[PDB]
C-alpha cells in the first residue's frame, strides 16, 4: 500500500521506515545533522532472504548479466499511475548510471532464485559527494530498487534496503540521498514533473497526453511546432576540451541551491561527456572562444504496455542547465529543438532549480507525478523545489 499524496500518507503506518534513522512524516525539522551516530561495528553477515532466494552481486561488465538486469527492470520497474507506461532504461544507460567514478561491485546488489538463477530483485548504490545546506558529506545515491512482480508484497524491498545499507556502512558511509514517486518518511523536497510535447500526434495516440480542453489535433500540432535549428550563437556538442570549464561552470552555478552534488572533474566527464542515446550535453562557445553556458539532457525511453502499434516513447530528461551569458529561456528553447531533432517524443523537466522560470513559457504542461527527495540519516529543514539542485537518473 504505497502513498502517492501527502494526504494518503498521513493515514499510513510505516512499519519499516519507523525503524530507520529518518524523520517521521509528522515532525518538522529545526536542526541539521545525523539522525543517529556513525556505527563503529557493522553486521558482517548478509541479511536473510526468504527461502529459495540468494544474494548475487551483478558484474555489469558481463554483457549477459547486464542484459539480465535490463530485463528485470524492463519488465518490473517503475510504471506510471495508470499502468500504461514503464521505464525502459537501456543496457548502456544502466552502465553509465551504475559505474560512475568510485563505483563498487558489491553495491550492485541482486537477488536470484536459487534453483533457476532468475534475477528477481535489485538495488544499487553509487558514491556521491552531496552538499546539503552548509554541510558537504560523502554519501551514496540509491537507485533502481526493483522487486519482480511475482515476488512483491513479500517484504523483499525492506531486505534489499537493509542489505544495501549494510554494504554501504561497511565502506564507512552513513548517509544517502534518493528519490521516489511515493511519499515516505520524510521528504526533504517535493518536485513536480512537467512535460513538453515534441511529437504530439504520437503522444495523444498512445494516451500519454490528451487533447486540451478546447483544442483540435491540428491546433495542437501548430502549438508545439519548433524551429528546425537552435538559435543560440556557438551552440555545439561538448568535447573533451570542455570538461574543465563545464566543471567550473557547474560548481559555481550549483552554489545557489541547498541540495546539490559536488562533482570532481572526473565525475563531470562521466556525467556530461556525450554518449549517443544516453546523455547529451551542448556548450555555448562565444565569439571569444569561451564556454559560457551549457545544457544537458539524458535519454530514458519507456515501454508502452499492451499497445498493438506504438511500442515505445522516447523521452528526454532535463539534466543540468547552466547559464551565465545566454538566457536560460533561450538555452531551454534550444534544448527542445535539439531533442526534437534527435527524435524524442517528449521533453521532461522537474520544477527544481530555476526551471519554473521557463516551464510555462516554453509550453510545458504539469505532470501527474511528484518526485520526492529524501536523505537517509540526515536531519535538515525541508526546502522548496527551486532550492533542489540535484538530478538523478
Amino acid at each position: 500500500g504505497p502513498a502517492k499524496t501527502m494526504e494518503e500518507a498521513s493515514k499510513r503506518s510505516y512499519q519499516f521506515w519507523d525503524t530507520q534513522p529518518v524523520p517521521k512524516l509528522g515532525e518538522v525539522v529545526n536542526t541539521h545533522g545525523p539522525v543517529e551516530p556513525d556505527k563503529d561495528n557493522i553486521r558482517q553477515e548478509p541479511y536473510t532472504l526468504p527461502q529459495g532466494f540468494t544474494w548475487d552481486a551483478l558484474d555489469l561488465g558481463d554483457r549477459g548479466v547486464l542484459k539480465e538486469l535490463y530485463t528485470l527492470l524492463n519488465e518490473n520497474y517503475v510504471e506510471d499511475d495508470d499502468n500504461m507506461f514503464r521505464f525502459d532504461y537501456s543496457p548502456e544507460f544502466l552502465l553509465w548510471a551504475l559505474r560512475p567514478p568510485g563505483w563498487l561491485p558489491q553495491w550492485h546488489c541482486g537477488v536470484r532464485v536459487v534453483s533457476s538463477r532468475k534475477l528477481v530483485g535489485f538495488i544499487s548504490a553509487i558514491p556521491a559527494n552531496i552538499h546539503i545546506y552548509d554541510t558537504e558529506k560523502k554519501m551514496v545515491e540509491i537507485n533502481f530498487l526493483c522487486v519482480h512482480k511475482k515476488l512483491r508484497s513479500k517484504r523483499v524491498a525492506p531486505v534489499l534496503i537493509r542489505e544495501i545499507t549494510r554494504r554501504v556502512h561497511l565502506e564507512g558511509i552513513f548517509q544517502a540521498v534518493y528519490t521516489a514517486g511515493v511519499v515516505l518518511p520524510k521528504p526533504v523536497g517535493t518536485c513536480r514533473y512537467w512535460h513538453r510535447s515534441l511529437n504530439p500526434r504520437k503522444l495523444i495516440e498512445v494516451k500519454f497526453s490528451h487533447l486540451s480542453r478546447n483544442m483540435t489535433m491540428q491546433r495542437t500540432m501548430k502549438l508545439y511546432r519548433l524551429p528546425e535549428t537552435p538559435k543560440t550563437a556557438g551552440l555545439r556538442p561538448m568535447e573533451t576540451k570542455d570538461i574543465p570549464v563545464v566543471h567550473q561552470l557547474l560548481t559555481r552555478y550549483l552554489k545557489q541551491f541547498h541540495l546539490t552534488p559536488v562533482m570532481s572533474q572526473e565525475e563531470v566527464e562521466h556525467w556530461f561527456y556525450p554518449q549517443e542515446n544516453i546523455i547529451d550535453t551542448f556548450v555555448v562557445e562565444n565569439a571569444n572562444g569561451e564556454v559560457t553556458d551549457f545544457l544537458s539532457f539524458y535519454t530514458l525511453p519507456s515501454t508502452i504496455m499492451n499497445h498493438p502499434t506504438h511500442k515505445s516513447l522516447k523521452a528526454a530528461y532535463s539534466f543540468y542547465n547552466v547559464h551565465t551569458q545566454t538566457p536560460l529561456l533561450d538555452l531551454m528553447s534550444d534544448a527542445l529543438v535539439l531533442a526534437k531533432m534527435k527524435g524524442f517524443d517528449v521533453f521532461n523537466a522537474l520544477d527544481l532549480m530555476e526551471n519554473k522560470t521557463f516551464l510555462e513559457k516554453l509550453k510545458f504542461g504539469i505532470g501527474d507525478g511528484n518526485l520526492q527527495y529524501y536523505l537517509y540519516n540526515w536531519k535538515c529543514p525541508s526546502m522548496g523545489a527551486e532550492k533542489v539542485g540535484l538530478v538523478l537518473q
Binding site: 517503475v78 506510471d80 507506461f85 534518493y178 528519490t179 521516489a180 514517486g181 504539469i366 505532470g367 501527474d368
Partner: peptide, 8 residues
C-alpha cells in the same frame, strides 16, 4: 528510484 509522470 525515478518517477514516471505524464501530463495532468
Amino acid at each position: 528510484g525515478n518517477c514516471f509522470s505524464k501530463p495532468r
